[PDB]
Amino acid sequence: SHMASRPILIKNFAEHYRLMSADSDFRFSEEFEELKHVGRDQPCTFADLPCNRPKNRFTNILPYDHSRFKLQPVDDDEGSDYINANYVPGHNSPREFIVTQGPLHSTRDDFWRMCWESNSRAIVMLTRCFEKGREKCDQYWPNDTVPVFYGDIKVQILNDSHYADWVMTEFMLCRGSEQRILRHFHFTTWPDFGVPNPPQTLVRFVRAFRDRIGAEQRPIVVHCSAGVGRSGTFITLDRILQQINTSDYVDIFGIVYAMRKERVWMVQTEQQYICIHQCLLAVLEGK
């Protein structure tokens, strides 16, 4: 298998990295460039409806139709089923992740409703609300233990835990007497430009996340800013760290290819793509 898959033998990974990164990442660049058109022929009809335009952060980051998360419709509203989000495959399920943009203030009720209707018990946030003084994500969660309603969804903080690179928040979610616990994993350390350096900080976060959530059978919500770059990087890394326990091959190219089919620009930059490889290399070398 050669077109949508580049399996690498785990024991040969250090060599493959050295080979791919040689000559200022020539082969890495060539390989990542092969992905640029993947999935881009697929329609984004609903995302481009007049009623839905205000719900997208970016005009060019739109959810594919075949793939988009659909909210329950409200009977008198045109795109009440619409949110900028896509089911994206993981290690355990073809619908393991729902990846979405950082909510706008205007879409945070939709966001919480998606969390509820999807039965999600986990959110992964890979951005700060503000970076370089630009709004990347509306703060859609409370600042204290005072419960806050978003649409019909009541959100309350039970506890939080602050680490060097991330904050873990446990929420109670209530909708009319129905009650759930949801966990919020907020990576707070992604730099203003480039990718985490050293990569180990990101690995530590993925380990802690996957350790805490186990083998979730319900969708995990993942977002950054646009919901493509950092989100794709996180998913690919989470996936391969599971893959290496159960297989002697890793297929990062194949992961990214499959993700591109489901959501636009999933691993967004060549730098992020190389970063995925560095993260795994650090794991295979015992840091």
UniProtKB/Swiss-Prot annotation:
The record's subcellular locations are: Membrane
Residues of the Tyrosine-protein phosphatase domain: 28-283
Which tissues express it? In 9-12 hour embryos, expression is specifically seen in the anterior commissure and its junctions with the longitudinal tracts.
Q: Give the annotated active site.
A: C224
Q: Which domain of life is it from?
A: Eukaryota
The residues the record assigns to binding substrate are: D192, C224, S225, A226, G227, V228, G229, R230, Q268
To which protein family does this belong?
Belongs to the protein-tyrosine phosphatase family. Receptor class subfamily.
What does this protein's UniProt record list under function?
A: May have a role in axon outgrowth and guidance.
Give the note: This protein is translated by readthrough of a stop codon. There is currently no sequence that provides the identity of residue 1632.
Q: What is this protein called?
A: Tyrosine-protein phosphatase 10D
